[model samples]
Target: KPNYALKFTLAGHTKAVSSVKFSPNGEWLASSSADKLIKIWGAYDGKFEKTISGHKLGISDVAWSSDSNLLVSASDDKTLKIWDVSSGKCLKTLKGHSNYVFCCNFNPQSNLIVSGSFDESVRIWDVKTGKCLKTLPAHSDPVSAVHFNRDGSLIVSSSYDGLCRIWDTASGQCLKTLIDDDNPPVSFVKFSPNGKYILAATLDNTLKLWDYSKGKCLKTYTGHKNEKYCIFANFSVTGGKWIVSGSEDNLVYIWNLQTKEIVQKLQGHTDVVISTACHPTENIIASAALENDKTIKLWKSDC
Candidate 1:
């Protein structure tokens, strides 16, 4: 077993930590909370840096641009706000969703943002102008998560409606719809680092890797509890050789990407582990917990 050590247990959020992300540059950690604040931390030492406050309601998600200079946040305020990381100021507020915005991601170019909302819509936004470029009436139930592929030409969205859809970035056209035979509600979805596959978290306690082009599931990673709240998962930092996710069972689970076997189970959080973020360039993982915990825990691997 790999020795993964707990580095820090950060407690700044007064409410549940909704999401945590390591900037693409790997220098900073951004965490959003039900307190309506986004806190920035130093990735290396886990020092508190800044608190960005502007959203009228709880923030559900945050995404860092590839340049690491900007961030976008989705909130229960029914809007997405773009922020300048350095200044800790809101640069633009994108308003169009009729219900809470659940998730958001920046395309590789950093000029576009894709967001999913409780309004059952997936929207493409112009980051610079704060304009809604395209809106895809994406799902029947709430859209849970949205993500962009490597080159920014493709986007994938998951929904509580029990389906995941891929869209053409430029044309806003639906390219594919992926659903398991059991049709489980997908809580979170992300494109693999290589762009050939997608990792999806379903409410049925399984994480599936899909060959999106073929609409086929390549692997299913189990042993995590995810029957209720939305949980996030990702490819490991080093070489994308592992899968990492937080469990409703109060642990962080790591699995061998190819073997689909449990390799590590990080235990510390006392409540539901809602989200996990793998450092972009290091063997570090950050995880956020639900209301009972209200903490963000950092773990480092000793390889």
Candidate 2:
């Protein structure tokens, strides 16, 4: 057995840290906050690198490019901004979503960016030209989360309407819909490293694993709390051996992906732990806290 021992808190954001992600190459950590700023941190040492600010309203989410050279962010200000990580310049302001952009991420090839919004739509943008390439009427309710699969051929989206739909990226067609028979709103969803499973965090107080190919609920993991924030889950870099998530109870819960049991509970933050991300190359994790405790904490386990 292993426990997630807290390393140190990375303090920088003034408001709630909404999203945190480890760069693909595992060199940097990027965080976006409701304070209307994006901060970069040194992943290994938790050193503050720089901040990118321009959004008039609070930022919702952010993602890093494949090369780790660019960062893309979605905001309540109703636009997505592409930034150059090296010079800290705003390269392009992508405009299309009429409402708050809830989530966004760069495709595996780094040639496209996909965004989900409160507008009930998912839009694909050209990363280089900053143009809206295609818009798909994604959901009946607000789109909560959107992620591209390992091959970038499909997009999986979770919606407030209690459904998770897999989409064809190039064709803009809904390939399959994974329904919640209980009809609880799905908060966020992400594809596993191998793209065979979809991990969903729901307001129903359950984290579920779905076989997207079969439109089946493989397993549901409970015991963690989720409230106002859309708490997301991640698979360990070593493999799909563990599933980890943050909770409104101000703790990080790590579950055995196969056993569906809580293996470890990590505590430190005074407020809600809204987001957690696993390192790409190490057996380490990072979490972001909500208001009154605006800091990102890093954690690791001794196997």
Candidate 3:
């Protein structure tokens, strides 16, 4: 069979695009950029629908609620704001992180949020009240990646302190710590769909999988562009059988999850590809790049 083809490209941001995610229902696409703007579009037709703005500086990360009615954005201005999807209005500003907030996500219930920042702390917030619920102090250096487990009962955070700490969300207690012998400061950490493993990406162009219960190394996936920037990753629809990531080499990489071999490489992107997201229920995937190529390209296998 032939490789996936470029389905379409969504372009609007004038600055470097940072992140892009498909709505849970797979009908909408949201993108954040260094231009300090967040744009929403139709996933099917690639039509721009709305633009969200308020951050004083570049927006770094964004996540959607399970219902796709709410969106959250973390920004370099040291704040994270929640927005209402229909009105494109800022619903609330979460201000507690001392430095720039780098990453954020809504919990599975869509009623809570978790954020990581340069302030060296992981924070949980109540989505309804817009109040900080708990501040977890663990990492000695900047925190970069934060995520909730499949059930929303656990939280995982990666930091510049060279560790990924798993926390019990209900009690705010550290459950386990994930680290390698090299002690590379982690750039991104994500909980696998089944809640039994974590995927940690490092500045060394390496990705490691860890067992959540035993804190044991399960697998390590290498060969991708991620030397700088916390470029993102995704699991394909094949029961998490494949890993997809953006490369610093201006390409998108797809790896067989179990074999750890490069299955495919996407090469149309000209600049550093910074983010890649797989669609919720389809074979489609999207890539957003850095530099002058501030656009999101969609790819899908038809054969």
Candidate 4:
């Protein structure tokens, strides 16, 4: 049993670190912060890479593209910016949101960028041209997070309105919606690698897994003592056969989803843990530790 977590000193962001994610290829780490910048980090040796300053307001969300050359972000400044990781340049500026942008991500297969915001709409953008392709105005409240499924045929989103909806990638049609029966604010939504299921984590300290094909709640697990920041979790592509979640409670719990039991806790972060992600080729997780503390920590399994 591995009981210790590793601390990677990625010191660059001056304020709250909002997002931390590993590139799909596991070669890089990207982070966004209240400093209104996106910083890319070296994954192989935990070194700082290039920093991109684009958003006028604090960046709220950050996502790495499939190609790993681009990173996308939304901000409080009513704008979304795309960055070229290597050159540290802003490739595109997308302006339209009337209010703060909450969450967004890029679809690897379709090369689409989807953003959710306080304006009560989700916008799908053409990644290359920076054009708005479609808008979804289904949720009346602020949209919190949006992510694409494995196959890129479907998308999933969570909102402050307490609902999680899966959408068709091309049509933007709502295929299936899972209303929080308990009226919990779903903080984030993500897809499994097989695209067979979806995971929604909420502010009420519960994380639910839903079977996509069956439209049924597969499992509900509870661990956090406070509202979860972002349900940024990962399914091990390297074979741990478990799920990991970071929470505002300053704790990270690794779970045996099949047994419905917490297998381990990756503790050491003294403050709220905001964003969590996994490395593609290794048994490692990268997490953004926010305000209560200012740092990102890496967690890996020993066996």
lDDT of 3: 0.88
TM accuracy, model 3:
0.97
Off by over 4 Å in 4: 1-4
Worst 10 residues of 1 by lDDT: 234-243
Best by lDDT: 1
lDDT tens readout by residue for model 1, 210-299: 998888999999998999998899898574478999998999999999999999999999999999999877889999999999989889
lDDT of 3 by residue, 1-303 (tens): 226679888888999999999999999889999999999988877788989989999998999999999999999999999999899789999999999899999999999999989889999999999999999996999888899999899999998778999999889999898766788778888999888989888889888888888878888888785767888888786334688888888989888888888888998998999998888877788889996788899888752
Say which prediction, candidate 1 or candidate 3, comes out ahead on TM-score: 1
The candidate with the higher lDDT, 3 or 4, is 3
Q: Put down candidate 4 lDDT per residue, 175-223, tens digits, no spaces.
A: 9888645767778788888888887888888888888788788888777
Error of 1 at 19 (Å): 0.5
Worst 10 residues of 3 by lDDT: 233-242
lDDT of each: 0.93, 0.90, 0.88, 0.80
- TM per prediction: 0.98, 0.98, 0.97, 0.95
TM-score rank, highest first? 1, 2, 3, 4
Number of backbone-clashing residue pairs for each candidate, in the order shown: 0, 0, 1, 0
